[PDB]
Design a protein around this ligand. Sequence first.
Ligand SMILES: Nc1nccc2cc(NC(=O)NCc3ccccc3)ccc12
Ligand SMILES: [Ca+2]
Ligand SMILES: [Cl-]
Ligand SMILES: [Cl-]
Lengths: 250, 56
Amino acid sequence: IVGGKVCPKGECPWQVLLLVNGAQLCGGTLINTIWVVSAAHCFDKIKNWRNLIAVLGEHDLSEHDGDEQSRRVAQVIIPSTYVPGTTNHDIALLRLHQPVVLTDHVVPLCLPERTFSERTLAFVRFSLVSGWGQLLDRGATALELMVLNVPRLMTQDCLQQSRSPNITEYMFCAGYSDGSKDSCKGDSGGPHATHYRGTWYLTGIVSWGQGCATVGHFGVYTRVSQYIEWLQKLMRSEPRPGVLLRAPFP
Amino acid sequence: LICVNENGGCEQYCSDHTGTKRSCRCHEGYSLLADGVSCTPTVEYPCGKIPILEKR
Ligand SMILES: Nc1nccc2cc(NC(=O)NCc3ccccc3)ccc12
Ligand SMILES: [Ca+2]
Ligand SMILES: [Cl-]
Ligand SMILES: [Cl-]
């Protein structure tokens, strides 16, 4: 995250850190005790699928304070329409091997109904984006979880204001064109969270952009409203052998 | 009321029905109050709420 601030410990309780052999991979979002939503592109180059770990209740990566909970990732589910190395349909649903325990520091974000998300949430101007990604373009990643308030654009206005891949109906833009404030590579997969009447909801996934905080460009986020029904169906399904699952979309 | 305007007056989710009818609904971990619009937690850690801030 560029141009944000430290999320106070416990104020981003749905944030997930994904690790591969101990190393930072991506962020994600807890949406109930065993399911995490992340970006498909985070998994393009995975070697050993059996060393993927999700950590909840994380804040300062330099220390252990006892609020962290780690789980193995039992399943990574990606839509059939996702093509590795490209930007469209950038969403993954991850099943944890054992539930996390909800606590003051570990709470899921609400996965909204589609209609509510499209008719109401899509019109809330500002939303929060978070992660332990780069603090600057070409710079070091964060040791403490960072957060940034970013405004959403209608895609017509995004394209008019930008100066790439297409912005599809499965995406939306948010942020700033002056190069001051953005999510960044290492924030991939993390939440774009939207407040409405006292409750926060999952509306986007940190997906892609041009460099980070590049003048003339906005952040591009996966439009989670397009995937509610797909996610809900998968969350009712039985696990299948083998970590990676490609599931039909729609 | 209609769900596309002002969220049908609902705090959370909204369904249109046949007639000038509307039903509000709540996410798991919440229940709907007698006003027919408001949602109150039914569990300790409902989704989308931040405990340290709810405590204050
Ligand atoms: N908001 C933002 N502003 C600028 C740059 C960004 C780069 C981001 N991450 C990546 O681009 N990862 C690589 C990738 C590869 C294949 C497909 C998709 C992404 C994520 C978010 C960004
Ligand atoms: Ca820690
Ligand atoms: Cl496997
Ligand atoms: Cl409806």
